[model samples]
Target chain A: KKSPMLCGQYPVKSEGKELKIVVQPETQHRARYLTEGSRGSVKDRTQQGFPTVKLEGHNEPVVLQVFVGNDSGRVKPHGFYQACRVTGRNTTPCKEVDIEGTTVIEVGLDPSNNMTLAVDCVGILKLRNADVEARIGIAGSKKKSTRARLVFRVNIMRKDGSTLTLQTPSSPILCTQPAGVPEILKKSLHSCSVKGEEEVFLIGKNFLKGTKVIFQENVSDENSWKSEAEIDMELFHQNHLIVKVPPYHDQHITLPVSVGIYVVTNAGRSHDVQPFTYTPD
Target chain B: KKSPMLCGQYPVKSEGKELKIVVQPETQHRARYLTEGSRGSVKDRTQQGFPTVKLEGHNEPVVLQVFVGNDSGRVKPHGFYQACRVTGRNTTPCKEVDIEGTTVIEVGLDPSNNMTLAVDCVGILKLRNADVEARIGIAGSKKKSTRARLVFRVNIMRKDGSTLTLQTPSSPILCTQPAGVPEILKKSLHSCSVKGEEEVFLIGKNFLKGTKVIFQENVSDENSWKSEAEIDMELFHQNHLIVKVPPYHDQHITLPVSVGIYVVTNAGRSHDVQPFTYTPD
Candidate 1:
């Protein structure tokens, strides 16, 4: 009996043309910065890496191994990350091999069912940041680029000694960075009595340790800036800030007044204004 | 050379105390009424018949087969429900065997991990309500009982030609019925303007189709009962009800008044009172 093809499906088409095999690009993989406070300049830093692909169009049990590299040209450059095999009661049978600094994971298809095999690139190996930066001759370069391209190949083998291979090189992935500005979600109190001094919580995201809460009657009112109270550092978090509402001690001020509140970061970035109301008791 | 055990593990214990084997009772299994409108007298109706157990003491993987019956001496009575094997990504490996109208589910444990098997009694074979009532010589018996006790035995086999069998007859499982009381969670509008007729949603559970919403000024005020508003049946669900706030047409009434709201089911069950407010413009 002929062993079935692994990795992906293979159906013969007519018209005496060259056989074409398409390897779908994995785009669902997400990358994050290695650590916080690391000053690597990558404008688009959110790109984790390329995701894994599920092979299709195969009958019977077979094994597959995937490698990341540039196979588009005559001279293929060695790729960075290697695809990892995950196996358990929930996963199909698999094996692994290490060859010439590249790790290739062999995945086995389910024999009793026609469910496709799923492959994931969880085992990642890459050069350090300093090495990559130095290799690009961008030493001391304040202007940094966080862009990189990924290419890969998939190999399928059958029990009958037949084999098939597919590759993708033209498509490259782009990673991006997270937002840097502060955003306010909601205030603990929508309206407070004019007797003020009420502690309120401002919830939001992208808040740095040095972010400040500013309360002002108007954008151009310099006098109202003096009423900006210090935020409670003990209750401060990246997404929450606790501050006391300034007491409306001005006897001349009218009741039921709406005040503007905004956040300011140490880097001079300011968020949009939110409103709070002061009502008479 | 001995072939590795494909099922369970076998390890010799000190002093050969027969490797004390215990089958933990399946208390986590819940039971639910097969259908709505059934008047069977069991208090926790959501408790399904299936039960789960934790396997302990054994170091290696073992296969377990369970059988349910009544343990009342000599000729034990076979229960109406059969043990069914449930297998999935979240479930352990198992297989099913049919023997004389009863199902025996064989569960396989991981050789290297603790096994907690969850068995479901999905194969429920019982007589209809009338047939069961008639068979028990309870003809015209207005009082119906939906209670039953579950007893089971587990057979554990080892690789070294050793077998262990355990039975649980002292412990029994009891299933019950759901509560019939209606409940109100909250109102969409806590306070409506005096110019009433505002439609508000009442969220809660056990709200039958014949449930009605009643609004009154005070719980003790018999005169306020006449102002009860009608609930919109078209926008009602088992967990939610929509009704219009009774208009405070009495011009002589004071502003900022608190009103009480409650729901009544067709079965004459009433929920606790919720408060609403009417404010002046």
Candidate 2:
């Protein structure tokens, strides 16, 4: 227990003095989902300071591979998150390489910079619910890990065919959703004795007049029956919105019926939907 | 598999048409933690319609109990969250009950509302990290389940000596932190070669001019080394704040060292701290 707690469990032995990570990735960064355009790289805690690694061991062109690691005792690649190549200014020479079918970044160092590689141009991409259906394709994993560390590794090929990998992980970076994303933390009305037409409050922050609430018969089936909830545009506050639940298509269903309802911003970005049930009158 | 999926797993099956739940709890509501004041009750989705259960089968008075259950398919109590009685208007006749050492709400019918029990006076409280130290008390549970359903149960004494327990679960309610809580989603600088004095960006939202950043030598020992970071009030934006990282106690450390950094709102509520390392220059 003592050795497992003290020893860094990464598969690397030659942690020589010459190779070290001076500037680590920022403690937190909002990683964009695969559906979003790249946001930016993880940086140091200082203003504009990106993750930097100092390697005086060699001036030779070594490959710097980036990974999204679990923020725990040992360094391991994150199953849900992957490192991506971000396009920006003063960026290093890097390309997306396939190591065991994973698209990871491989960075090439410049000989003039005194063997220091600053990682300012990197992005983190995540797999969403549909991507995982591949659990129906999962709830053993409802609330997945939200924090992860940036593990920077450099592989050096010596005169012998064997390779040497030096890895260092940065502090935990919180990978959560974007700010002002219209997530309904609470909804006032989930059911009506009749077929909808009930005004309810969507309890959350920052709902706009341009926002729209939609109800559907089935969440998985996009093309199913859908109706738009009538939101009182002028009556919405920062914390709550007065939206009338739209009527159900089948008002005469004998048993209780449940369907999905979600808020969609002007840009068509949708929050996670909740089930709204309709009981017999 | 079919029986497990379709079976109404909660014990007690006098589930005739008369014993039905007409109105259920709203799909979502923010539960105030044990440390905070009571917010309000979980309600039905209607603008003011609370969770209502219609029971025409019983004409006499019955006791309604509230519970926080896991959001899964079964109706069971949540280990971390407990239900509480809130001080509100037009509330029902209920008292805090101790059933097997757990404090839950028990409601009595008014006998005038036509045998309908509307649960509009319920609150939820959770145990925080320090409360759980009894894991040494816990990481197998870092990201605790944030979603739970409200289970409304009623115990009725029939003509015989047997008791009939009727239970119904509401939709999932999301119990997350309050909105616009000054959380340091990202910090720009976690380490300085020297003993601090580095201006970094605290990546977050809605930081007021009165906000202050604090750094501590140890997170557990609150009375240890502490200093407030100098924040530039005029240079802050909606998303980031420019603040100088405070000085550390020992500047001449030989190896890598880390401490805690957190953002406290003007209200004195502190977000989770991130480790800021102090590397020897």
Candidate 3:
């Protein structure tokens, strides 16, 4: 029996008649979410870099053209964004424009850049197609009590081949925990010391902004409600906190201890405790 | 005046249409090569595996199709290639085809075979327009003495949507001395080590295949060549090799008399000899 022709999940159309579909990693992301996290590079959440194709014998000054979306409200005529060469070398502006959508084209390869591959940024293309939406405040509730309703935004490119200035809303990105928390998480130690001083590492997910972290009772606390060595977990998705195990605290206890992880977003919103044990050698 | 639209060096296309061009790190690639001598997963070849957009909490399944220009003089059907979801784990075949090039789609994040990034064996999309002449040839000298010419076989999708296959004359990939051999050709051991009594590792580049490796006056013939020990100097663009330094024949020297590589391909090749030093603490 013959199988049906399936274009990976995301199918798109061109200005012309035919329906064209290409498998892009970013096609799996939420409609409007640009970067992996609400911060950092798009690659911070997903591995960034482009596909490379090397012309075996051709060393001529080769040029490649690609189309990328403009989701950022940062650009004046368009939006603000940066482009890099190869993995992370000399970076430049992606100024080229396309008639089809809101995007920029990038160019050139650094001499030091490896020429074995045709292109890089094959994976980083996840930043395509920004799905923008408007924020609608909830009704009938206290000004601060109601959750904000999300809205979708779209871009309109004029036909005369000129730029049109329009204020479009940014897309909404939903936050979720990174999947597949390994049964046993292993972290590399930055330093090592003698018997009493053990280099340590802490691992957990959704360590979102303003989260709190408390290590075992080592340092001193100021008052009855205060604890020793507290950390703002929200600043980092993954944290590596190093501390020495006190002589008295090194007793052979049960399998693992609850490495306390708690989030305090917007005062009351937070995640449950993420627990793990330390086995020092 | 405006900083050239900070786009990376490559262009991105959406749904078969050229989007905007903007330079970003995610778009740049310098060090990483597509697939020459380096080793990387298929996902490493492209930017992929981001989260999927859940429309009304419904995440739609995606289908990816692949077409190959086989030696059999036919453009294999769309679903003929294997599809492996690179993200989580579970894998499934793509099932839909009526997609427009203008719409935005997402990849699924379920770890099953359905969620991982998909790849085709023909080496990414290699389709030319209907009228363009597809070219394929091996790189080598007209006398066929220099090296193997790259095979240029093209598969064309005709105006009627039919497939046509053609083979370009085989052209040889010529070999020449290093482009700019530095005046002081500094060489270092990329990797090396000795294992229990019989094993060893000497990794570097420019060493030919079937070359003799020597350590401490101990000579190992071509027969004892370890599988990964010799690096293909000619075929591989980058000049690097990893060979096993044979057992030392003389212990009195304490250090190896020579730690160097030699190659014996169609033409003999060898790298400058360097003294071998072993430190055991």
Candidate 4:
């Protein structure tokens, strides 16, 4: 038997009780112009999918999936499923999907079977080409040992289970060399230290001890380097440096900061890095 | 050979490049007094035990799990590991772990490598007793026909995974005789519905159709048996119940709403229907 695909699990509360979930129609469909910006509309499905409102006492584990039946007329449907737990708590937001028109489909509850299951919107299938495609900068340059660090914004469809489109850059390539240059991550901020005055900190790994990593104002497709500041390698490899704001400069800014690594092999290799943002404190 | 235990994976931005991780420690472990009322000292080890920061990156397919040693003396000689990332972006927050006064027994790169693994504090044999003991309520009644619901809280320790204690009500023990008492939830603003012009709503599942559910003026438990109005249960069953709110009711007032289910059984089996607030939006 084919193994079932795994979506996100139930969002458990500190009390260990499952959260309640509810499914509702999109508040606003993009086609509907009236309620576009008023407050909350179905059009907001751009981020994930349409929102599914949670109901009271519905806290439990939830699994949502977007299915397209193969049966005639029922095969293609629009809209998505918003499955969640019903713990007599509150209804949950709908898990959005990409379905245009009013196609009928069933929202299977407890898709995983933990005493939590429900079905909504049975009958039709709504079909819409709502897929998220992203562009990335793959390895480049075998000579300058220059490697391009490409960053792509992948659109995640809330309604359907679509594979993220990973597109590597194909332009003034960085490394024309065959094997290409070695790449390394100089610094990172996997987690933050909220307890100390320095709300932000650094976490570095996977590189030579004295590697130099820089934070760029913005990510670049080309090897054009423009960094806010350069960080030392030793301080990061050892001790684990945590600096205060102001003096530290790039305190709190937008995400996807540019990064680069400089390797000191006889055939010096250099590469750009991906940009990322810190989660809300 | 024994198969290695599985650990959780790190989260990476669906978009953006994988930046180099940076690990930094606070300039000094700020010192602050532990007071009850105030936000408490931001300084000091106000953060109990070792803090686990989240990591990002991966094909969006793999779920990674990194380990942090739980040995009491692991960080003793000042033993500890800082943050770090594998590839992509780099610079800011210089990734690194600090173990100046502790011992760095083990570290994780790609946690699945077996060299690194994450275990819950409680899951660890040596640190089992370090967890905070907590209570779980199981409600049951002598009447086999009735439903039983278990409701309580569980307190867990951040360090040395051990259950410290458990607490519950003295009377009306959670685990009663009834086999089927519908569970209620806490009040929330997220699940309210607009009834005609008013923004009143109903709470809980198994709400019998046409039955009246009221909100008590000042009650503590979930099932105060207060009646404000009647609900249209015909709309949905075993899941959601619909109710209209009065125009005069304050939308801001989020407290004191109770709900109960009305049912008739041929067996005349008593049912213990508990009330909870999952937000009656």
Candidate 5:
């Protein structure tokens, strides 16, 4: 195992009983950030329920292990999410086992309720794309899949202690994102004066106070100007805003100054360049 | 001016011209966390439109100033939401002017288009409650209101530099939250064996990887338990999780054991303490 596989999972035969996830996990889950924990980001809780994986034929109790996997239908560590240990209930006592520094939650099924627990488990945790790349880019890791799956494994032991490893997986779960990027959908004004002192309303998604509304002479051309927009100072809702037009380079020019505009919200990542025009007064 | 007033704004009557926001800004805009800026939070862009405050009578050009405010229907500094500048078209050129460190965006009205922007502006930006409390908590700061508003101001200038500060406000906009926090909505199993081990599906919102499924003997009492649930790994969506029930302190107790279960999402902020029970095998 020199290079870690991207979607690695169990590789054994299903000789006897079948382990199935009756009620699979939901299709989406958003990862929370460490910085924006205050003022309540409001992704308060998921609207759906956790999975209900049922086990049958294995009359004896078994300990089930759950891990993150890629969307390729195999068991492997996810780049962004990790099973996190939390403070409180509904949850039973379990430990975070680190295998080669990676962690997993291992818990045994109740004697009377083993069937049910061959089941549901709500998991959590963090990481960034680049950091993930630095640490996990080892043996042939591929592009990170936007979709994820849960890997369920159970080790059934015999009298001599040799254990049989059986595994199953949940359907693909989408690793959801937040609303923070900037993109212009529609604007109130496309043409302003060469004298260029005017207000225009822009409506679209992921516009933040740190958001930058730039008027570029050309995406490739270095000529550009920033929004004379309002200053932002809090964590509130405002995906759109009003901006003052930047004066054209030459007000006396006979031809109208045409340029493109776009938004930059996070890390100077820009998107959806739009069109605008300036006319001589 | 010593102690900044909450919702502070213009005192003059809205005479000569009428300033009204015909299409009010969206009621909700989620505050983005600086830490959670990657993997796309899905809150990407608001589905609603920004405000469209239509002005009448006074047709002269003006400079509009937008700021954040509390939900109290007044012009003052909000604990959250603020006017933010952006990068691109749709928005006009603007500058970031800092006032004693805090900032705001200011820009002029286009002669041909002042009426519309006497209109929409999708605002954005950040901050936390405690920091705000540290800096802004003054005499009668009162409890922080959950709701927020947008404060729009303009300076009507005449022949002299003496300008009349005209201000208007957008309907209270909600600083929305992410789907992060953990809350137990519904569960498939409320009662498990005293041996306390079985997976039960929990249906709720905001359960994260680090999310804690805590089982307490009592909300105020000291006894408790946690899920033998599975481990999580990623920024995927999982508001609900399957948690293995925690065993009762006295597994042999003749009486049916009852306990309170709750979810701990961000900062140990717990909510919805649900009910769980344990029965003798």
Candidate 6:
């Protein structure tokens, strides 16, 4: 059987006045959320979604253009989002066009090599700031959904030099705000005596209820953490947690031992690494 | 001053029916020789060259086409090499066109965003196999030089929809085959008693005439090789070398010590690691 054309998860074919455009699966084109953790890079919590195509039945070269919209295909909204341009060492050459507050990117295809063309949507720009409010609001309207659609058009130049344009829309690509990961800021003390049972406080963000404090010894070894001891939680809050360090059983050691301390939330997420030292008494 | 378009290291400007094409420096496009080292996905030897354009004095979006040849601003060669198409998740979109035996890629440009377009030439194809033999011949002809030029044309659509094509060519990009790195195979003896001086043979490739056998007592520490003892070279060949293992001077240790055996050429190139064990005598 012949393969189908894809835009993300949407399988599409040409209809009247529509030229079949396929995005090859080998292309790493996708929509990613920008994060603040690093400058000029995607966020850690942002998920990557693939939007690809598989060409069929035509050996002629085709030109591709990409558009972004929240509308599910009924109509193009007046102030819709535009797919933002993402360029780097690994990106393919492309051109961008702006029409009525919407941006369109022209993609090039290789005709003789293979039948697949990967269309990567590196970023999306909301046309208006108010569109964000309209999307998250309880309007229950399909036009204001948080989901987005990658709409593309393929133009095929025929033997006579005339062109045929095909308009195809991909399935919905959901966009949602991501929650920040848990982080451990700083501890009140850097080190404690091996006698143990020292009171310490860890300050950080996203410390929810039912959080557990674990003290792992000899963290270098993979199996060293199997003997981890959970400290008694004296007090817990979103930004601070109090606990008593577990006593070290191996007291006869000639040298000091260093251990890593961490916090685990009810959601099974662990915080950053903080080191604590056990000095020989 | 406006920036000029660039192809590899060449600076070019259009004159007489040529559109001005300037490669943006931010694109980091340049010609690089392919290497065999594996770095992530791309082979170790693959070089990424960026050819970018900054659209100046024009507002309409333009299309770009690239060709590789030896034409010195007059006529293209009869059978010129074509630039290969390279695409990945991070690459920009491009289209390839085949004419005769040459492939020309159309690079899309964006005028609104920084007025700059970045084009990547992933690989290059030779127009004919005889061209290789012709390059290495003693003809001394500049036309048959192993150097290549990246020739590109930019097409701009006027207000009346008429297209204007501009041509520009880059400087000479030299292509040369790379020499393989040295590799070490298995040794004749796996273990040697600490009582000292044992004969061993190391089989490998790319062993130069002045290759020396060095025994490193501790390979883990970066400075451990500072005290390494060089073995007397008995016989040496391109693929095999004979040496006597240096005696273990450190007699204080009760446990057996493992040392690393390696070969180093006069050019300071080191080979792969081969381990030799010293049992307690």
Query: For residues B1-281, what per-residue lDDT tens digits would candidate 3 score against the true structure?
Result: 11111111222222232211111111111212222332211221134521111111112232222211122222221111111222224432232222222111122323243333332111222122111121222311211221221112222334585533322211121221222221102223322333313222222333333344444322455443222233323223123222334443343444323344333332343334444444321
Residue B169 miss distance in model 5 (angstroms): 1.5
What does candidate 5's lDDT look like per residue over B1-281, in tens digits? Answer: 11133334674336576656566666666655433342111111254444555556577666656566677754567655445555345545666565444556665555487565623333456555434544566433445565766666666665675555666766776677644556665555677888877655555565555666677777664434444344223222344345667666786888888777777765453566777888887
- Model 5 misplaced stretches (Cα beyond 4 Å): A1-281, B1-15, B33-48, B118-122, B129-134, B137-143, B178-281
lDDT of 1 by residue, A104-218 (tens): 5555534454524334323323333444444545432543333333333344453567655543332433333344788776565556777787776666666686787776777
For the candidates in turn, chain A alone yields TM-scores of 0.40, 0.56, 0.25, 0.19, 0.54, 0.54
Off-target runs (Cα >4 Å) in candidate 2 are A1-18, A133-139, A178-281, B1-281
Indicate the residue-level lDDT of B159 in model 1.
58
Report how far residue A154 has shifted in candidate 6, in Å.
3.5
Q: Which scores better on lDDT, 2 or 4?
A: 2
User: Please, what are the lDDT tens digits per residue for candidate 5 over residues A23-50?
Assistant: 6676666644444431111111244445
Instruction: Provide fnat values for all models in the order shown.
Output: 0.00, 0.00, 0.00, 0.00, 0.00, 0.00
User: Candidate 5 chain B — worst ten consecutive residues by lDDT sum?
Assistant: B36-45
Report iRMS (Å) of candidate 6. 26.8
Candidate 3 Cα deviation (angstroms), residue A279: 26
lDDT of 6 by residue, A64-181 (tens): 6776655464535324445766675865567776655567676665566564555553456544334343454543243445566666666665568555555566656554443355
Q: Model 4, residue B127: displacement in angstroms?
A: 30
Report the lDDT tens digits of candidate 3 across residue range A1-281.
01111111221222321111111122122222333333221221244632232222223332333332233333221221222222335333333433323333334433345323223331122222121111112231112211110111112234675322211212322222233321112222322211234323333333334444333322233522212334423222332222343222444644333343223332342234333244443
**Which stretches of model 1 miss by more than 4 angstroms?**
A1-180, A185-213, A220-244, A254-258, A264-270, A275-281, B1-276
Better of 1 and 3 by TM-score: 1
Window of ten residues with lowest summed lDDT in model 4 chain A: A127-136
DockQ of 6: 0.01
Per-prediction TM-score to the true structure, in the order listed: 0.30, 0.33, 0.22, 0.15, 0.32, 0.33
